[PDB]
Structures are given as structure tokens and as C-alpha cells.
Design a binder for this molecule. Sequence first.
Ligand SMILES: CCCCCCO[C@@H]1O[C@H](CO)[C@H](O)C[C@H]1O[C@@H]1O[C@@H](C)[C@@H](O)[C@@H](O)[C@@H]1O
Ligand code: HG
Ligand code: HG
Ligand code: HG
Ligand code: HG
Length: 264
Amino acid sequence: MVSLPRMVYPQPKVLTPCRKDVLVVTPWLAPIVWEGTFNIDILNEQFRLQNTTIGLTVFAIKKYVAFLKLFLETAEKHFMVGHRVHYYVFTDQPAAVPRVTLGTGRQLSVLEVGCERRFLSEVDYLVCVDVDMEFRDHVGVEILTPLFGTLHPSFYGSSREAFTYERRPQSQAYIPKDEGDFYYMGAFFGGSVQEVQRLTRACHQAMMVDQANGIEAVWHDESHLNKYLLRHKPTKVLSPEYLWDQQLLGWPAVLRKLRFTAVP
Ligand SMILES: CCCCCCO[C@@H]1O[C@H](CO)[C@H](O)C[C@H]1O[C@@H]1O[C@@H](C)[C@@H](O)[C@@H](O)[C@@H]1O
Ligand SMILES: [Hg+2]
Ligand SMILES: [Hg+2]
Ligand SMILES: [Hg+2]
Ligand SMILES: [Hg+2]
């Protein structure tokens, strides 16, 4: 909206590819976010000028409440630093949530589980992740867009036939062998509040239909997420830098940074 201020940075090079080892744009022209493709200073300016507020939702039930301290502490160091952040921790153990010190402009709300209209008035974007993870490097506004999915670390180099999509036609999450762009992991997705609510409503309804027909998608929520993103292309796709498991997969040359990883 408002004009950007004067900024001094390296001129983009039209005749020099960002990466010669990976795909940086999808066939529907959505950027695939890898280190080396973006200038965070320009993006920070764009989103700060709009006073962007990002909501980060996480579910911590039962023994998973134990992962909250590390999750929140590292998010404080690497997640959307400089921007307004609102953490939403859904848990069955409110008193078990650790008291983590937050930077200015950042807040945390504990919601006990046993209205979505709130999200629409409190944040601009919603980022939904799993709690048994830790941030190890920058995860910022470069990911914000109407709707985004993240490439699963175990399948980014696999052919669609190898993807573990739901293959039974009796399921609403069904995807045949000749269809599919990527295999997105259910542990990291998001977008505008509106698009995220549309996705969750669609998946919830599809799961109810499957339940009524006596069938459960092979990878549950993740299977439905993949079916949804197949039919509603994400406006940005995050590379595996954003969802990794170093103990299981190491640190391949294709990853210049490991930003958000599984906790052993
Ligand atoms: C030692 C076990 C290897 C699992 C590799 C494949 O990852 C799994 O993929 C399915 C869908 O096919 C689903 O997404 C769960 C996922 O496993 C989780 O994520 C991987 C990356 C590891 O961190 C596992 O420990 C997780 O359980
Ligand atoms: Hg570049
Ligand atoms: Hg969410
Ligand atoms: Hg769905
Ligand atoms: Hg979903």
C-alpha cells in the first residue's frame, strides 16, 4: 500500500538464476521459498508497513506439553522477529504451559481444549505447526501469502507415484497415480486467516464424510491437506528448509539453512 523508503541493496541479476540446483517457482507461478531467492530487508519493509500480525497455532496435548518450552524459546529467537506475533497454544493442561519470556509486540494465549471469528480480528495470517519442533534459523515474512504448504522432507525428490497420498477411491482424500504436484507435510501450513479457515473447514467436512463411509485416510489430516492443495494451488510453497529432521536426513547440499527441525 504505502510507498517503500529508499533502500540500498544488490541489483537483481536478470541473466543469473537464483538457484541452478532447485525449482524456485511452481507451474502456477507460486514461488518456492529457498535461501538465495529472497531479500529479507525488502520483504520486512513491505510487511511492517502493513503492521502485519502473525498468529502461530500449536496443539500441545498430554505429554507433548513438554515440548512447549523449547518451541517457544526458539520461536522467540527465529520466528517473525520484528513483527507482531500472537501465539495460540491449544492444550488440555493450561497450568503446564511454561512461562516463556517474550519480546515486545509478541503475546501468547492459552486455549484449553477438552470462536474462529477471533482469529479474523486478531491476526492477518495464521501459521499452523507441530509443537515437537525447534527453530534453528530464520523463519520470517518470506513465507506469508494467501495460502502456503511445505514440501515434506522425505519426499521432495520423489516421483508422484511414490507419494504416500491416499490411494483408495472410497476416500475424499483420494489422489490417483497420475495426479499430484508435491507431497506437503501436515506439520507446517498457513496463509491468510480466511484461506486457512477455508482449508480447515473443507478438510474437516471431508474427514466427516470419510468417517461416515467407514474409512480413514492413510495419513489422516495430512492426506486431506494434500488433496486440498492439489485442488486449490498454494500461492507459495516452502522448501524443506522449513520442515526438516536432521537426525533422520542429515544436512544435504540442497539445504543452505535448516530453519525448523524435529526434536529427537
Ligand atoms: C524413522 C521413521 C521415518 C519416517 C519418514 C517418512 O516420514 C513420515 O511420512 C509420513 C507420510 O508418508 C508422515 O508425514 C509422518 C512422517 O514421519 C514424521 O516426520 C518424519 C520426517 C520424521 O521426523 C518422523 O520421525 C516423524 O514421525
Ligand atoms: Hg536470487
Ligand atoms: Hg491453524
Ligand atoms: Hg480437504
Ligand atoms: Hg487439512
